[PDB]
Design a protein around this nucleic acid. Structure first.
Lengths: 51, 71, 115, 135, 187, 151, 103
RNA sequence: ACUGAUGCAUCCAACGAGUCCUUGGCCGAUAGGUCUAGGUAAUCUUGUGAGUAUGCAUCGUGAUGGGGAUAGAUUAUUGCAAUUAUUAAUCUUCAACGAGGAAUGCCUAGUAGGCGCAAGUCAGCACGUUGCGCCGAUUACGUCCCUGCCCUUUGUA
């Protein structure tokens, strides 16, 4: 009637939980993390970069 | 540039022509002759079975390379 | 004479659309089986009743947004005002036009004329 | 021996093999020409400069009516004709006249697709900012 | 033992002339031109390889034909058979006498004494004369058969025999004398 | 100068792996004609053997050599099926202007030849066990002609 | 009681957390002297994400190479389930997921 | 283009990744569909039978079968919807381009280059990026000439 399309798939369906942003959405292993959001909190999750 | 059929004038010569030469290849037939390389393969395959000539090496699938038989 | 296919325009309205689809390209059939709901189904009523309203001698312009509706030999000889983007434009749909989509006929933009 | 040839109002060349010589006819190509050669019982080892009167007469019959010799329809060029409504094979200067019909159909219909042929731009929806430039 | 393709013996034969001796690697030797081994850590491991390996190695060009050593083994295996066919003796002795005469003697370097790009006469080393020899052998044979319907093996066999010879028809023996044309003048 | 070298003993001619695989197919393709049993498809005029291939095969006995090759390939890997045999006769498709990729083989022709071997009963299910396998009569059909070809 | 067979999974992010548990629980078994086999070290499932460093497009296009590591390790036993509950329940580690399984 | 293209046969990788990845059997030229079926994964897909490669045939230097743009017509697939055509197929249609002008980039050993595969974005779409292997060369082991850099003495409006 109003205020809803079919919203099931594509970038419009889903957003970053931390900052509410669709762009740059890391969905590997079911993160649902926007990249700007993901890199700074990556050490606190577990991810430690080397080589 | 080249003639595609046997040319049955030159077939009577071609018994004499190729066993003279030292190199026998794809190229040396259309050197002596002016015909496409393809006939040369079926020529030197015919000169294996009917005629005289012998393989330099047992075989290859790309470069044939026969000698005159020397007999 | 010169309708659209081997099947003539006398017969087609009579022919059922469901079995009609077999004589269709590849996307019309896919679209039709999936189809149809909502406001294409209202135009199956509305464009049909648009034929009777004129007194005679062969219409009046029914406005639509649906570019994605495929035309059908039920509704031939009608008129459809198809949406570009701001304006509606007139399309008197013919015996020949069956098969194709509506929004193919109405263009979105002006072609060129550089300089 | 015959240098040069003509089948179906189109000039087929000698000095070429029989399968590849038949692709010089418009509306014929490589895979169908094998099916023409196999079902006409022509030897593919033979050259197109030869071609006896039996060999050409079979090819014209198959090129005209390939439905008769059990070619199963997906091989055909204009599959479902959209006029008489049958599985049809278009060969030679028929294909020129069919292309003149089908384009000038779309100009009268006034599709978007027909106007691309009228102006002579790219039809299939390709990015013509940079590409297809020179004209 | 040690024979190339098993039909030839490394044992016997000899270097043609003084210089370019010991730089060449014969004597001991491996059946099959090919060897995957480390030859580019020091700067004179390059003349430990036998020159039949350096022929098949440098025969792959350009971008399209690089790699596929197995392919370059075949066409050299045919080339050594053809060399044997004409002026039969040893394919290797004809090949070693070819790469003797193939490369250039002298060369023009740019030494200006500040400011100018001015040429000057300089003799070529024994290693570079072997490097240039095998390069110039192939680039004749590749260019000869690039558009012609002549097998590369044919070009290579022909090119090698010509180089041993003083015919000058070859691309290599021309490009020797083309450098020695200007290298005479730059004295 | 003749070619050197042997193995220490003269090689045993018994099983199919000792035979060179191309020379096996040259014999057993001719065996399928002269025996008679195996039987033709209708579609042989069409095909080409794969979605990827842009042309039909030149040799008119392309089916017999394929049925020869697949039957020995059961002896190499016992357990396999139709999606397996789609991979083994894969090939470089040429996409066009784009870069090249792999593609799978034709499923009709590869399935049909197995059903004709099932009718004789050389290769068979395996209804519960996933994948086809050659039976007892399948081996003795192979191994009797392994000794013949080298002879 | 009955003749049973137990094979206990161990997983964590750290190496040092599991090397406590592997040393402790085998010595905890050797209190009672059960039929122990040693800890079967499976291959390491390294997880990987590569994002761009910059928020926007500017500069050279540089990349992180982030990594997790996960260490599946398996203590084997042949003993009934009532015996093992004493061994596992004491000496639980911080941030180490452990699951006991018969067969 | 002939160290090649095409058709047959031979037999070899590593990185991943999945609550979607897909074996097995039937139907279909193809795509794909249909009925069972294993998998929370060193267990199942999968030992992912990857392609340059190798062996045996036909083609013959012709813009030819090299090249596959441009274009008509048909059959499936994702989606609620495919027209300005999301792709994948089947038949045709058969252009430019014969080694690239002046300028100028990348690179020293499992490296260059070539050949594939996997993941990221993703309902569907890679000619892109990030990793992974395979086949595997040529030429230096020096230099401050060009283009920049670092440290001294020196000149400066």
């Amino acid at each position: 009637l109003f205020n809803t399309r079919p919203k099931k798939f594509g970038p419009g369906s889903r957003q970053c939980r931390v900052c509410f942003n669709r762009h740059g959405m890391v969905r590997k292993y079911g993160l649902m993390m926007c990249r700007q959001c993901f890199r700074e909190r990556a050490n606190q999750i577990g991810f430690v970069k080397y080589r | 540039n080249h003639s595609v059929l046997f040319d049955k004038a030159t077939y009577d010569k071609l018994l004499a022509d190729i066993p003279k030469a030292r190199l026998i290849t794809p190229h040396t037939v259309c050197e002596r002759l002016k015909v496409n390389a393809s006939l040369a393969r079926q020529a030197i395959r015919y000169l294996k079975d009917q005629g005289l000539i012998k393989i330099v090496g047992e075989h290859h699938h790309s470069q044939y390379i026969y000698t005159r038989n020397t007999s | 004479t010169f309708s659209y296919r081997g099947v003539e325009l006398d017969k087609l309205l009579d022919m059922k659309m469901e079995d009609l689809l077999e004589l269709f390209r590849a996307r019309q059939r896919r679209k039709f089986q999936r189809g149809i709901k909502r406001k294409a189904t209202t135009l199956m009523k509305k464009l049909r009743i648009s034929k009777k309203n004129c007194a005679f001698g062969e219409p009046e312009p029914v406005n639509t947004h649906l570019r994605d509706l495929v035309v059908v030999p039920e509704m031939i000889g009608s008129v459809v005002g198809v949406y570009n983007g701001k304006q509606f434009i007139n399309v008197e749909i013919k015996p020949e036009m069956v098969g194709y989509y509506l929004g193919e006929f109405s263009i979105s933009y002006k072609p060129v004329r550089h300089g | 021996f015959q240098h040069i040839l003509r089948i179906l109002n189109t000039n087929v060349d000698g000095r070429e093999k029989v399968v590849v010589a038949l692709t010089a006819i418009r509306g014929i190509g490589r895979r169908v020409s094998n099916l023409i050669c196999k079902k006409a019982d022509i030897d593919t080892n033979k050259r197109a400069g030869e071609l006896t009167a039996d060999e050409i007469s079979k090819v014209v019959a198959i090129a005209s009516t390939p439905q008769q010799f059990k070619i199963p329809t997906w091989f055909l060029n204009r599959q479902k004709d959209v006029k008489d409504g049958k599985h049809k094979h278009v060969v030679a200067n028929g294909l020129d006249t069919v292309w003149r019909e089908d384009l000038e159909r779309l100009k009268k219909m006034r599709l978007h697709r027909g106007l691309r042929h009228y102006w002579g731009l790219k039809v299939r929806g390709q990015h013509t900012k940079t590409t297809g430039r020179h004209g | 033992e040690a024979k190339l393709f098993g039909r030839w013996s490394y044992d016997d034969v000899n270097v043609s002339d003084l210089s370019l001796v010991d730089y060449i690697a014969v004597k001991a030797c491996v059946f099959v031109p090919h060897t995957a081994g480390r030859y580019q850590k020091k700067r004179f491991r390059k003349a430990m390889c036998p020159i039949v390996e350096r022929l098949v190695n440098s025969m792959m060009m350009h971008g399209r034909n690089n790699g596929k050593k197995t392919l370059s083994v075949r066409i050299v295996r045919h080339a050594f058979e053809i060399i044997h066919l004409m002026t039969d003796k040893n394919p290797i002795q004809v090949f070693v006498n070819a790469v003797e005469n193939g490369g250039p003697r002298e060369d023009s370097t740019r030494i200006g004494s500040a400011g100018v790009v001015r040429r000057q006469a300089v003799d070529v080393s024994p290693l570079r004369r072997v490097n240039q020899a095998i390069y110039l052998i192939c680039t004749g044979a590749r260019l000869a058969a690039f558009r012609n319907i002549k097998t590369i093996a044919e070009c290579l066999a022909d090119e090698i025999m010509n180089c041993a010879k003083e015919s000058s028809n070859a691309y290599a023996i021309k490009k020797k004398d083309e450098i020695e044309r200007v290298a005479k003048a730059n004295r | 100068p003749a070619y050197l070298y042997e193995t220490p003993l003269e090689t045993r001619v018994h099983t199919v792996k000792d035979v060179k695989a191309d020379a096996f197919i040259a014999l057993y393709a001719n065996h399928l004609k002269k025996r008679g049993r195996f039987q033709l498809p209708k579609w042989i005029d069409y095909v080409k053997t794969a979605h990827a291939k842009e042309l039909a095969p030149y040799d008119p006995d392309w089916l017999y050599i394929r049925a020869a090759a697949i039957l020995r390939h059961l002896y190499i890997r016992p357990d396999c099926g139709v999606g397996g045999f789609r991979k083994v006769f894969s090939c470089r498709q040429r996409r066009g202007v784009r870069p090249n990729h792999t593609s799978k083989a034709s499923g009709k022709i590869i399935r049909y030849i197995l059903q004709q071997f099932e009718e004789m009963g050389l290769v068979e299910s395996d209804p519960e066990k996933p994948g086809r396998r050659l039976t007892k009569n399948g081996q003795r059909e192979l191994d009797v002609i392994a000794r013949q070809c080298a002879k | 009681q009955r003749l049973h067979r137990i094979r206990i999974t161990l997983t964590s992010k750290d190496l040092k957390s599991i090397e406590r548990v592997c040393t402790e629980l085998i010595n905890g078994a050797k209190e009672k002297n059960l039929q122990v086999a040693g800890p079967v070290r499976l291959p390491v499932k390294t997880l990987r994400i590569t994002t761009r460093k910059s928020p926007c497009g500017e500069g050279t296009n540089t990349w992180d190479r982030f990594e997790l590591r996960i260490y599946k390790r398996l203590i084997d036993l042949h003993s009934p389930s009532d015996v093992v509950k004493q061994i596992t329940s004491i000496n639980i580690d911080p941030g180490v997921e452990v699951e006991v399984t018969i067969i």
